[PDB]
Amino acid sequence: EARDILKRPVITEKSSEAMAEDKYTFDVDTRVNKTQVKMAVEEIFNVKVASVNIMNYKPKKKRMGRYQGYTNKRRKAIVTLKEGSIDLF
Amino acid sequence: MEAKAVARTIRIAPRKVRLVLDLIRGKNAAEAIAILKLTNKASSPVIEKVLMSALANAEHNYDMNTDELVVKEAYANEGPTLKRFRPRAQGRASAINKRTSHITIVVSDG
Amino acid sequence: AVPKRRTSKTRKNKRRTHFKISVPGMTEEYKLSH
Amino acid sequence: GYRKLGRTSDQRKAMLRDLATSLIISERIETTEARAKEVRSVVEKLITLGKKGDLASRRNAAKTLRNVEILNEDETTQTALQKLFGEIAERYTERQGGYTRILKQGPRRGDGAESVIIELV
Amino acid sequence: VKRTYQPNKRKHSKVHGFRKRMSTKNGRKVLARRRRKGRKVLSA
RNA sequence: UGAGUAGCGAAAGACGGGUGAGAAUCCCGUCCACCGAUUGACUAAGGUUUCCAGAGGAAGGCUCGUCCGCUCUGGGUUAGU
RNA sequence: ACCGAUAGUGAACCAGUACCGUGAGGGAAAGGUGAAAAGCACCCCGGAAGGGGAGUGAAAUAGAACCUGAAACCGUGUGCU
Ligand SMILES: [Mg+2]
Ligand SMILES: [Mg+2]
Ligand SMILES: [Mg+2]
Ligand SMILES: [Mg+2]
Ligand SMILES: [Mg+2]
Ligand SMILES: [Mg+2]
Ligand SMILES: [Mg+2]
């Protein structure tokens, strides 16, 4: 059970900046630590992953009239590695 | 021929506009752009875009000459308001009534 | 210190006889920019 | 004379000293009517010290003219005090007083205030 | 001046949480009037 | 209606230049001036995306407004101590 | 031989909702284009809003606050005084 842990990448100006140091970015499910994440990439991609950081977010507020609704919640995984690379697009 | 033009939901009171129009009625046309831009008010720059729409449609839609062409009907009439509130000394509050107007010009030959 | 009555439609309008504005001068349109 | 301009003594003595200076640099400014009928006088009493040019007038041509503005005209640097005694004084060596000129533009948009120009001649 | 309702979060839940309404029968007749009337927010 | 009346919340600003359909009130620059065991700099409660960058000017801002803690759009909180 | 949008239910629509209160608990407002979207291609004034012509339609003084459209209140014109 790997391909339900991590979902999709984040391509930004910071995520594009960090690929000059082989730091890549993903958007992880909740309910998951950083050790479940480390052996996930390391068995899809065969990259010999290195250390990992993580964070959370909080609801924002989309609203366009009669739709006073909140939004889902995130948990990013700024990942790092030395030996190798992965081309995503 | 009698051309016209109307401006709609213009954000000024009528009682403030109606002071300028009395200086504009029953007069020539080029004897009005002058008296308008030599009157320090805030009404004047919006009654000036509203002649020049009634003069630029007596040239392309209805084919009259601007040489002799006078002003026969100008008037302002009330509109919808916008209710607001200002707080006061004690917990009480007080009304505010921000008002609007519609403007209407008519240019005619004889 | 408080109005005892209502102000009619006439007495409101008999009063504004002088509550108008005035016209600029007229030099040849040119301004009177002395 | 005797105009106060809604500004107490300690304020008016510093508003009429900035007007006298920044004028001289650019020789043409844009003010309200009242103020320029009062630098009509302050600045006309300030070239009359520049024709003497003596060592004493420079000492009373500094108690109203304003702190040393390190100008920069064409490839240079001046002071407003070594421009007033060298250059304006020399243009104006053979006239009597009356070297200012007021000119009426229109009013302003916000506060409805008569606006005028003032220059040198 | 100084006014009432100097907030906090320990004390807005130690006195009006869920688990203080359940531990007390008169607080279960509180809940059981807010489910029947139909409100989207039971006491927390 | 009262009525274009009472009021517009303690306090030093002036000129020049630039962008704009449009400037006392926005951006850059000069001098002057005030608070100063505070109108400084850090942290907690509590508040909960108000933070940042391009855009925008119907409403809100006790005036104006090309500007904004306001309106659209996409993005920003990284721990063996 | 019941109501027909101030009525009937607190709620015909976003309703036990927004909003008020530490809390228990209290409480609203708000329906209708046309038979048919055929929802005004194009030209002109203006920075945009809005208006004038053209054109769809049986009628646009039925143009998205759109079925009808009283009264208070606010105005332009002039037959006698
Ligand atoms: Mg004049
Ligand atoms: Mg007055
Ligand atoms: Mg009175
Ligand atoms: Mg500055
Ligand atoms: Mg900001
Ligand atoms: Mg009805
Ligand atoms: Mg019908």
Curated annotation (Swiss-Prot), chain A:
GO molecular function: rRNA binding; structural constituent of ribosome
UniProt signal peptide: none
Keyword Cytoplasm among record annotations: no
Alphabetic keyword roster: Ribonucleoprotein, Ribosomal protein, RNA-binding, rRNA-binding
InterPro entries: Nucleotide-bd_a/b_plait_sf (IPR012677), Ribosomal_uL23-like (IPR013025), Ribosomal_uL23/eL15/eS24_sf (IPR012678)
SUPFAM superfamilies, alphabetized: Ribosomal proteins S24e, L23 and L15e
Any one GO biological process: translation
Claim: Signal is one of the keywords in the record: no
Superkingdom to which the source organism belongs: Bacteria
A Pfam family reported for this protein in Swiss-Prot or TrEMBL: Ribosomal_L23
Any single Gene Ontology cellular-component annotation: cytosolic large ribosomal subunit
Subunit structure: Part of the 50S ribosomal subunit. Contacts protein L29, and trigger factor when it is bound to the ribosome.
Function, as annotated: One of the early assembly proteins it binds 23S rRNA. One of the proteins that surrounds the polypeptide exit tunnel on the outside of the ribosome. Forms the main docking site for trigger factor binding to the ribosome.
NCBIfam families, alphabetized: PRK05738.2-4
Family listed: Belongs to the universal ribosomal protein uL23 family.
Protein name per UniProt: Large ribosomal subunit protein uL23
High-level lineage: Bacteria, Bacillati, Bacillota, Bacilli, Bacillales
Curated annotation (Swiss-Prot), chain B:
Molecular-function GO terms, alphabetical: rRNA binding; structural constituent of ribosome
KW rRNA-binding (keyword) present: yes
GO biological process, one term: translation
KW Iron-sulfur (keyword) present: no
Keywords carried by this UniProt record: Ribonucleoprotein, Ribosomal protein, RNA-binding, rRNA-binding
Gene Ontology CC: cytosolic large ribosomal subunit
One Pfam family here: Ribosomal_L22
The protein's role, per its UniProt record: This protein binds specifically to 23S rRNA; its binding is stimulated by other ribosomal proteins, e.g. L4, L17, and L20. It is important during the early stages of 50S assembly. It makes multiple contacts with different domains of the 23S rRNA in the assembled 50S subunit and ribosome.
HAMAP family recorded: Ribosomal_uL22_B
Similarity field: Belongs to the universal ribosomal protein uL22 family.
Subunit structure: Part of the 50S ribosomal subunit.
PANTHER family in alphabetical order: CHLOROPLAST 50S RIBOSOMAL PROTEIN L22-RELATED, LARGE RIBOSOMAL SUBUNIT PROTEIN UL22M
Stated name of the protein: Large ribosomal subunit protein uL22
From Swiss-Prot, chain C:
Keyword Ribonucleoprotein in annotation: yes
Family of this protein: Belongs to the bacterial ribosomal protein bL32 family.
Keywords: Ribonucleoprotein, Ribosomal protein
A GO MF term: structural constituent of ribosome
Portion of the parent chain present: 2 to 41 of 58
Ribonucleoprotein recorded as keyword: yes
GO cellular component term of the entry, any: large ribosomal subunit
Protein's recorded name: Large ribosomal subunit protein bL32
GO biological process, alphabetically ordered: translation
From Swiss-Prot, chain E:
UniProt-recorded Gene Ontology molecular function terms: structural constituent of ribosome
Region (Disordered) location: 1-44
Presence of the UniProt keyword Cytoplasm in the record: no
Keywords: Ribonucleoprotein, Ribosomal protein
Stretch forming the signal peptide: none
PROSITE patterns: RIBOSOMAL_L34 (PS00784)
GO biological process, one term: translation
Keyword presence, rRNA processing: no
Record-linked InterPro entries: Ribosomal_bL34 (IPR000271), Ribosomal_bL34_CS (IPR020939)
Pfam families documented for this protein: Ribosomal_L34
Cellular component GO terms held in the UniProt record: ribonucleoprotein complex; ribosome
HAMAP family per record: Ribosomal_bL34
Similarity remark: Belongs to the bacterial ribosomal protein bL34 family.
Protein name: Large ribosomal subunit protein bL34
Taxonomic classification: Bacteria, Bacillati, Bacillota, Bacilli, Bacillales
